[PDB]
Every structure is written in C-alpha cells, then in structure tokens.
Antibody, heavy 231, light 210 residues
Framework: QVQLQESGPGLVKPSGTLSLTCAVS?????????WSWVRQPPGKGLEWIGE???????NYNPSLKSRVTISVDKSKNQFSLKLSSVTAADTAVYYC???????????????????????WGKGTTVTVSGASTKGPSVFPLAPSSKSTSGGTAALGCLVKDYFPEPVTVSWNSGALTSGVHTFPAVLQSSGLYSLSSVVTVPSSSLGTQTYICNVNHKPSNTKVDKRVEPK | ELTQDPAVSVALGQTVRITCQGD??????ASWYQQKPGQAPVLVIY???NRPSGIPDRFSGSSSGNTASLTITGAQAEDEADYYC????????????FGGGTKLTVLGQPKGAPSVTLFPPSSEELQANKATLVCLISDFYPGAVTVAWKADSSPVKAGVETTTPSKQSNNKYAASSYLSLTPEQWKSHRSYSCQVTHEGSTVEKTVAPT
C-alpha cells in the first residue's frame, strides 16, 4: 500500500539545477524496491529518468546521465532527484514511481522478475523560465438566482494572474468532491495564467452549508482559502 | 526503437488491438500503461500478459518476437485514453524505453450540448478595480466550440480570452472564456452575453449589473 508524493520548486531558472523529493508513505524505502523517476513534457510521451536501490546503486537514462543525480535517504524515508544545467526542454511533469525487483538481462537465472512500475506519484510540474513567479488573486464566484437552474446551483472561485503553472483547487479541505470541476487555465496575453473552479450543488443547500475553495499555488508557496457565499 | 501507432479508433463494444514493435521486445516481457488527461499513468499489463488486481479482465496482452500487443475486448467508454508500451533495451546497462504512445478514440459515444454558466464580476474584484466575466462551458461532445461575446446587443472582442477544449472524466469536453472589463464599463452597461456555438447550435447566457 505504498503511496508516493512529489515535491519540487515549480520554477527553475535556465542553467539552474532542478531539485525534487518524493515522500514514501505506507511503505519503507529500506526494502527491495527500485525507487524511480519519469517525466512527461507538455503534450508528449513518457521518458524514464533513472532508478535507485536503497543501498545506493543507480541506473540512469543515458541521454540524461551527464546531468542527473538520484539519491536516497533512509532516515527521512524519501528519495530525490537533481537535474543540473536545465533548459526549456526540461519543462515537464515529473513523476516518482516504484518498480519491484527485476531481472531482465539474458544472464538472469530467473525470468519471472519482470520490470514494471506499479505505483506512481501524482506528479509535479516543473517550468524552466527566466521570468519571475507570481501568486494568484482569488475571487469568489457567488451563487445567485442567475446561477441556479432548477434544483441545481453553480458556485465557484476565480483564480487570476499567476505564473507558472499549475494551480490546484479543492473544496472544504477535501470534504467536498461530488460536482467539483476545475477548468484548465487560459494563457493570457500578458503571459499570466487564470483558471476557475466550479461546484454544482443542490440549490436548497445555498445558505445552509459552508463552501470554501482551497487554492494552492505551490510555485509561489501561496495558499488561499476563499469563502464563497450567496449574493 | 519502440514504435506504436499514435492514433487508433474502436467502436464501443468492439475489440481493439494496440501493437508495439521493436528489437528490445525480443526475449522481453513487456508492460503497458494507461494514462487519462490530467492523471498519472496506470499499469494495466505487466510481464507480457498479467493484470494487476484492479484492472478489468477485458484487458489482456501477448507478444511474439519483436511485437507485443495490448487487447481490449468489448471496449467501454472509460477505456478512452493514451496507452504506452514499455521495455528495457538489450544493450548497455539496459535502460528503460517507452513507446511513443497510442491515443485510443472510442467511437459511438453520445453527443452532448454545452452546459453554459456565466458569472458576473464579483463585488471583491470590482472593489479591487478590475472586472472579469467568467463563462464556463462543460459537457459538450465533440470537443469543438467557438465563443463570442456581446455588450448589450453589440459584439465585443477586446479583452476576450478563451481556452481550448479539454477532456472531462466522462469523456466529454470543457472550456472557458473570460471577458476583461473595467469596473465603470461593467456597472454602466445594460447586459453582457456569452455565446457558445457547438455543432451548428448556439447557447447564449446573459448577465447584467444588479
């Protein structure tokens, strides 16, 4: 029941060093497992970065070998990735993952230790840019009669003018997920992003239940909990 | 290296085979990964033909020589996704190699009209001396839409920003369009409208300062 969570800086300057951490829960790093990294550039396919064993042994993608270092920390129960001399090509979503012990070479006595990655993290978005980071301004999208349709009503949160991607939004600290729809952001003319998140709710619950959108913009270390109330 | 078709279609309830071809598959037990938009990859087949516990039995795998295959029997709507094959190369220290990916379109899904909600600028934003109209568009299929804006009954194109559609979890599509105004423009007008055109029909919502 291993679960993995990535943690990284969001923005990294050109020629700088990317640094990422993966926290391991529901399992121990001090076990036969290949703790691994994979990335996914926007709109493209998956690319293996490397893997590490808890004793220290690593294997890297030969096209990243000269820039990548993967490390493990048994006390904190986490492993990590460093990618130096980053450029725009290194802009991608970075996933940590777990691979069981494997033996794929033809010199292996056993052939049933297949190689695969069964557990994946949620991924973390890294952007390589000389522009500066900017946190969002959050505004409530209040419910009213012109957002109510029959027994259903809409309310939401507007998240304006942030950089870089991404922003994630939850409602009532995770205690509300039915009816939640966070829309993909728009890239405005200024180079900044904006998105909205909306929840459809029974219109008899307007004014009888509290609605709070939890906006997180990790690249600027900004969280905003916004109270949404009827007009 | 490791080649697969980038695009493959299948009709609902029918069977589809997704192939992966390359010299690294010789003597190797491939694995296969499913990815939906906005989500991490999920292992669907490992060791040539084994399924993890949570994967439906309609997924299966095979391989011979340099070619491996993922088969979905009686494909369902929730199988619409990108699929990647995986191997480790037989040279060097055996680095991991991903196929380029196959996008699986599942045909015969129900069309849908767009659901349009239009929000006026919030009191808080106006008091911050800005004004944004927010037109939220969801649950349309296919995912092609155009959006026009009206000030009273006149067209307005200044200050419009509109996303490209994105795939929802129910395989329908979503989009949004923002109209930027000044607070004095918003409070003095009669109304503002968002017009959403989809498959020959138009949905228009209207809000007014009050």
């Amino acid at each position: 029941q291993v679960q993995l969570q990535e943690s990284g800086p969001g923005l990294v300057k050109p020629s700088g060093t990317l640094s990422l951490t993966c926290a391991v829960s529901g399992g121990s790093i001090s076990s036969s497992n290949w703790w691994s990294w994979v990335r996914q550039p926007p709109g493209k396919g998956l690319e293996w970065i490397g893997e590490i064993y808890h004793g220290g042994s690593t294997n890297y993608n030969p096209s990243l070998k000269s820039r990548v270092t993967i490390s493990v920390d048994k006390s904190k129960n986490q492993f990590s990735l460093k990618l130096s001399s980053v450029t725009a090509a290194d802009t991608a979503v970075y996933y940590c993952a777990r691979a069981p012990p494997y033996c794929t070479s033809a010199s292996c006595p056993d052939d049933y230790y297949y190689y695969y990655m069964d557990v994946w993290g949620k991924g973390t978005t890294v952007t390589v840019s000389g522009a500066s980071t900017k946190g969002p301004s959050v505004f409530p999208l209040a419910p009213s009669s012109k957002s109510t349709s029959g027994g259903t009503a809409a309310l939401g949160c507007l998240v304006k003018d942030y950089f870089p991607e991404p922003v994630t939004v939850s409602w009532n600290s995770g205690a509300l997920t039915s009816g939640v729809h966070t829309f993909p952001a728009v890239l405005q003319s200024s180079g900044l992003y904006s998105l909205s998140s909306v929840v459809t709710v029974p219109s008899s619950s307007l004014g009888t239940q509290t609605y709070i959108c939890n906006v997180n913009h990790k690249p600027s270390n900004t969280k905003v909990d916004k109270r949404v109330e009827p007009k | 290296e490791l080649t697969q078709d980038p695009a493959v279609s299948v009709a609902l309830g029918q069977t589809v085979r997704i192939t992966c071809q390359g010299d690294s598959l010789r003597g190797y037990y491939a694995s296969w990964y499913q990815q939906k938009p906005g989500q991490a990859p999920v292992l669907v087949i490992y060791g040539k033909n084994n399924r993890p516990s949570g994967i439906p039995d309609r997924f299966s795998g095979s391989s011979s020589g340099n070619t491996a295959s993922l088969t979905i029997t009686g494909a369902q709507a929730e199988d619409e996704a990108d699929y990647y094959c995986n191997s480790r190369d037989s040279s060097g220290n055996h680095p991991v190699v991903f196929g380029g990916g196959t996008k699986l379109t599942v045909l015969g899904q129900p069309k849908g009209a767009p659901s349009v909600t239009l929000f006026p600028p919030s009191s808080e934003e106006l008091q911050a001396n800005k004004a944004t109209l927010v037109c939220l568009i969801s649950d349309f299929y296919p995912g092609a839409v155009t959006v026009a804006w009206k000030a009273d009954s006149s067209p307005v194109k200044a200050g419009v920003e509109t996303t490209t559609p994105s795939k929802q979890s129910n395989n329908k599509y979503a989009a949004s369009s923002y109209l930027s105004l000044t607070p004095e423009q918003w409070k003095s007008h009669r109304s503002y409208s968002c017009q959403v055109t989809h498959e020959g029909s138009t949905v228009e919502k209207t809000v007014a300062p009050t």
